[PDB]
Amino acid sequence: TASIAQARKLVEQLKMEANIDRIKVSKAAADLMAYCEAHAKEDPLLTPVPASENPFR
Amino acid sequence: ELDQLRQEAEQLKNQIRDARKACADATLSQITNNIDPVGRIQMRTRRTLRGHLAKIYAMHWGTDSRLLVSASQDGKLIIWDSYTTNKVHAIPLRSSWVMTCAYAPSGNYVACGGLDNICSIYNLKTREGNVRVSRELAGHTGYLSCCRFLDDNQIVTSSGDTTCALWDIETGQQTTTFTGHTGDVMSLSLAPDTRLFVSGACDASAKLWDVREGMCRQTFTGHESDINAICFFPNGNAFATGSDDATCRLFDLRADQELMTYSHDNIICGITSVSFSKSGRLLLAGYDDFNCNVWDALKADRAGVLAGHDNRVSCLGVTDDGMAVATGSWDSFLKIWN
Amino acid sequence: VQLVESGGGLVQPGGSRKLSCSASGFAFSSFGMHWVRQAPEKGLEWVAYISSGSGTIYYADTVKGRFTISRDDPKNTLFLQMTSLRSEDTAMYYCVRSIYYYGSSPFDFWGQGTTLTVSAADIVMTQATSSVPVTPGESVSISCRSSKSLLHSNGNTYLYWFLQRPGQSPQLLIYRMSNLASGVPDRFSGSGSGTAFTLTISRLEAEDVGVYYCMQHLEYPLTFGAGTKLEL
Amino acid sequence: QVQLQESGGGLVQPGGSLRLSCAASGFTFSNYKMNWVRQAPGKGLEWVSDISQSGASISYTGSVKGRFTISRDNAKNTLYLQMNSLKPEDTAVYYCARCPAPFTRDCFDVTSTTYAYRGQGTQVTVSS
Amino acid sequence: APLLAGVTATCVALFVVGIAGNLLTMLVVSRFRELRTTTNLYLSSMAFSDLLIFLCMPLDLVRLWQYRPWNFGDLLCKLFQFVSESCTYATVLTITALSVERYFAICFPLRAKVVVTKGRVKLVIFVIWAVAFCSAGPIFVLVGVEHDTNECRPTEFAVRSGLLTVMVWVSSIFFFLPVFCLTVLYSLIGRKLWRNHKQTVKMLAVVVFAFILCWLPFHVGRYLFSKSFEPGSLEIAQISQYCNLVSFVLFYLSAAINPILYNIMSKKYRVAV
Amino acid sequence: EDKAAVERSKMIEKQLQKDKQVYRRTLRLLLLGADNSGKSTIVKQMRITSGIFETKFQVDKVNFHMFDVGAQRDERRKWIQCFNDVTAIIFVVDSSDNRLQEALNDFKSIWNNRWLRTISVILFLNKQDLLAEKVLAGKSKIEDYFPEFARYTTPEDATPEPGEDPRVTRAKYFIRKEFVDISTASGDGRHICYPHFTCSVDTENARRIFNDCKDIILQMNLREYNLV
Ligand SMILES: CC(C)(N)C(=O)N[C@H](Cc1c[nH]c2ccccc12)C(=O)N[C@H](Cc1c[nH]c2ccccc12)NC=O
Fold it and tell me: How many domains does chain A have?
């Protein structure tokens, strides 16, 4: 009974996924790298702060 | 006609596959190949939070980066002051089978739920001085797997009934229901702007949802087994998922496909939790093996290990300022690492 | 939430008496309790303190050994035995609840007060001026000074601002020198520099007139200021 | 995309023979213990047989023991069910399921509520 | 010479082995706080007792080596003897407490402990060490320096007064009661487990036999030493030297094995090592 | 004041110690079974949209909390993990010679699961009266679903339970042997299966659980008190 609807409910969803705008993976990697580079020194785990500033002494 | 619709579904799947493969002009590994390695990073246990009688199932940091709530399956939430290890609050739960907990970004409420299929909201600022159940949201037909506050009045939940939901806490009824997953929704992560959220749902697929419209923007596949953990990348354009197939995977929303995979041949156990450091360079993942691993999210080589838990590492979370990472285990301890 | 005191009245010097206080509408067992006196025409002065669980008890040096503070949590009551009452003991006694944990606001709720009449090293807090003339709609500032720096090594600055209107018990305005209490309008703001402090009211509204009191919670003996009077 | 595609089936005479195959993609076929499950008309899914990662351990349901034999080709990523002496009771849709996890000994994969790691299945009909 | 040389060599070997085992027990119970069960609290107390016994071993052995008289200060001999006796009684009573605790754990697995709850286990230990001290108090009057020939032993005051006999009998309690408990309760445990468990029953038998072997000669030798002062008792005097030698070696053997019999069997303790 | 905060923490810890006592002295059980099993009636005989039900009973002054999943989907591989610390799993199976193979598979998965691999199983071969009736009628044959039953004969050591036909004895002991073979195939001894022939009417059921818990706890004490 409902199988026809569910499948259609799926199909249309797939359509809404097929027609989305996409960017090249090179650009995505470039932005991720740029974000990591911009905020490197702002990351305590990446760049351990001196003990004078660490609250978990 | 059922068969006709199946053919259409297969054709659309192939179209999506081709469309996203055309965009795969390069790989994150290739582009990051020249970036300086993070080096071996060593984290030490600055605090050990003791007091839970049973295994800890979830923990969440407060937005101030000092208070954190943890849930254990003895039927108790504890609000800890992580700086001093003081127990700010102890909240007894009506159902001991809690599987998730959340801290309101304002700090006024916490949330928790589990096998009771209910999301209980606790008010931490009662004039009576005691923590009280302000509301309990019912309507999920499966155990509550995750819950995250959008606001003092709005909470988004996921359950084993395969659906997510957005609630209006004041009225206590589902403002929106998010459907499309075919397995238990095991985790969800809210985007920094809280306009979108991703969910990993025991069908090897992650899904991106827009809260206002209430439907799936994108579906990401590539995991081979159930997804237990999902976390948004700090800039909101990517996210990372950990799964039972013993690998983490970084997907990019705009490229609409997998960008990286973090796996080592010596790791043959599932991944229970994942989180990013503030800059997003480190991806911290807890494992069924009793130790967490810190991955270089850009190069995908193991940057470090957090060993020190005697049982399954169940929950993991980095503070909003990035000063420390808390890991809660089935040995009933939370450890702050720095 | 309600705190109602009783047991006052007139007593002869050198006698003994029992102030009692019934608490309602809140988890009395989880709140520490203070007794704070006010002379018939002078400022606040802290008397005694009993912690939640009764594990810690403190008395003011002026009454140490003479007063005894106790609590009956099952009956939700706070008692103060007094003996060898002197002339200086005449005052209105307020009971004040206070809960301590990260981010809490102690001294938030005050009792209605009970009057007691007797028949005929500490940190000193000084408020710049006892009186200031004001009119509705203007902006006013109140200054406070302390012998020691109320700034602690952990970063907290333990200064509290209370307002007592005529005929009413004091109500908490500011706790820890920069945090507004529950229900306090945004008009009030607190700031300072560890040793000197300022409370600013912007566009003074009616009923803001009264005596503003400073208090320090840095060390065991809690001390109030002389008070600064704002009148129309 | 984890996907399992069953092939083979159709109509067969009672007492005949029939080989079901399943091609598996989207996961490393070697690590997972594989299963054959089936659903008869007007009945729930029932576990038919299973084969371990390397094929060393095999198991069948009692009604099938000796008649069907399960096999796996890790190199070809394929799972086979060679059925001999078909009975009218064997009329059913046969699905190829797998373990939810890549190294566990146990399974939770006969569930009706859309188990994620089984194929669409193939009809097997036995009638004279 | 060779006899006492062999005794001394065996005693140093037992010294190193027992010191290592006892220190291992304390360090494991301390570092791995997950192992701070009631049994391990008892075993840490007993490890401390045995460690003190071993640390007193050298000044005890000098009385056999005998190359110099007891030139050491008076009131140091009494402190030494008191420490040795107190730790002996503490070890014996902690063994008895472990026997009772194991009996309740195995023969009544689900019964809730009323008289001694987990928190009160510490209390029990403190009572043990209390009695061990009280029962060891009379040593201060019993043993002293007697003589070029200074020697530490029960004072002739004690011998002629008969307090040596009474205290022999008193210390006999710390053999009779422990033996009675470790026999009755461990026989009951073996009975319940016998109805695999065979290794557990065998190790219980080993524990009981080790206790008997080490402590029966100890009290027999003390009684013989008490009776050796009787007139014309040259047979008792002759046998007393050898009995005391064997009791010496067996006393320190008990101190050395106690950390073995009670900890190595537990694999979870073995993993912690 | 930081000291007042520390005092509040200490009071919280005191309450947590009280809760620890209560938590340790209570025994938690997970009740599992299929639709046809009479686990609901077993729950109903244990007297003295929710996704979990708790039944708390008491035997000889020891408290048991027994948990039965309510509104949950049939995919259990995730919520079952929540029960890796219970003292026992009461697995109820209907003797219906056919759901028996499905129950065997359920038991096998519960037995070999990584997180349940140290939990003992109390196995209730429920509905023994129905099994006796079905065997005596002769209309349904176990050999149809378990051909190995053609070769089975009752072991000599088997308890006869007098007043009982040899045929029903053979059937019931074969059914028990299936589950016991699954349980012993692991070859580890980390946990034990305690089979019982029960009917939902049985007033002995509670006692059975108690006598099994006594054993399970005993097996823990053997390790906790350095006896193995
Ligand atoms: C140190 C200690 C407490 N362990 C100890 O034994 N003290 C006894 C003295 C003693 C105390 N209370 C008694 C009640 C009755 C009789 C005697 C006593 C002792 O030393 N006796 C020695 C033989 C001996 C030397 N070192 C030993 C080590 C182990 C066994 C025997 C010996 N003979 C003469 O002195």
Answer: 1
Q: Sign of torsion, CA E129 E133 E136 E140? A: positive
**Separation CA E51–CA E12 (nearest Å):** 14
Distance of CA B298 to the CA centre of its chain: 20
Flag if D111 and F75 touch (Cβ within 8 Å). Answer: yes
| B198: β partners | B189, B208
Residues 6+ apart with CB under 8 A from F36: F94, F96, F99
Q: For residue E237, what is the enclosing H or E element?
A: helix E234-263
Closest alpha carbon within chain A to B14: A18
Token couple for E5: 């040389």
Neighboring chain D residues of B183 at a CB cutoff of 8 Å: 114, 116
Structure tokens, E233: 């008792």
Give the span between the Cα atoms of E216 and B136, in whole angstroms: 69
B292 touches chain A (CB under 8 A): no
In 3D, which of C121, C202, C125 has the Cα closest to residue C158? C125
Residue B275 main-chain phi, psi, to 5 deg = -160, 160
Domain of D48 in residue numbering reads as: 3-126
Q: Is E261 on the interface with F (CB under 8 A)?
A: no
β pairing state of F62-69 and F26-33? parallel
**Resolution rounded to one decimal, in angstroms:** 2.6
**Residues of chain F contacting D, Cβ within 8 Å:** 73-77, 101-102, 105, 108-114, 144-148
Its domain, for residue A48, covers: 3-57
Distance separating alpha carbons of residues B177 and C181, to the nearest angstrom: 39
**Cα torsion angle, F127, F131, F136, F137, sign:** positive
Exposed, middle or buried, A11 (CB in 10 Å: 0-12/13-18/19+)?
A: middle
**Looking at beta carbons, which residues of chain F come within 8 Å of E269?**
226
Q: Residue F181: count other Cβ atoms within 10 Å of its Cβ.
A: 10
How, if at all, do strands C179-180 and C171-175 pair? antiparallel
Q: Residue written as tokens 């989907």?
A: F73
| Pocket of ligand 1 contains residue E50 by CB under 6 Å | no
Q: Which residues of B280-314 are buried (b: 16+ CB within 10 A; e: fewer)?
A: bbbbbbbbbbbebbbbbbbbbeebbebebbeebbb
Helix (H) and strand (E) counts in chain F: 6, 6
* B240's tokens: 């990372």
In 10 A of CB B92, how many CB atoms? Answer: 12
Q: Are strands E143-146 and F26-33 parallel, antiparallel or unpaired?
A: unpaired
Yes or no, beta carbons of D106 and F102 under 8 Å apart? no
Give B-chain residues touching F49 at CB under 8 angstroms: 117, 138-141
Q: How many structural domains is chain D composed of?
A: 1
Please tell me the residue having the least CA distance from ligand 1 atom 25: E60
Within 13 A of F215's CA, how many CA atoms are on the CB side? 16
Residue D8: give its domain's CATH number. 2.60.40.10
- Smallest CA-to-CA distance from C41 within C215, C229, C230, C232 is with C229
CB contact under 8 A, A56 and B83: yes
Q: Which structural technique was applied?
A: cryo-EM
**C78 contacts C137 by C-beta, under 8 angstroms:** no
C157 secondary structure, DSSP code: B
What architecture does CATH give domain B2-337? 7 Propeller (2.130)
What CATH number is associated with residue A34? 4.10.260.10
Cα separation values, A53 from A40, A48, A57, B40, B338, Å: 17, 10, 9, 22, 12
Q: Which amino acid is at A23?
A: I
Q: Is D115 within 8 Å of F75 when comparing Cβ atoms?
A: yes
Residues 6+ away with beta carbon under 8 Å from E126: none
**How many C-beta atoms surround the C-beta of residue C9 within 10 A?**
10
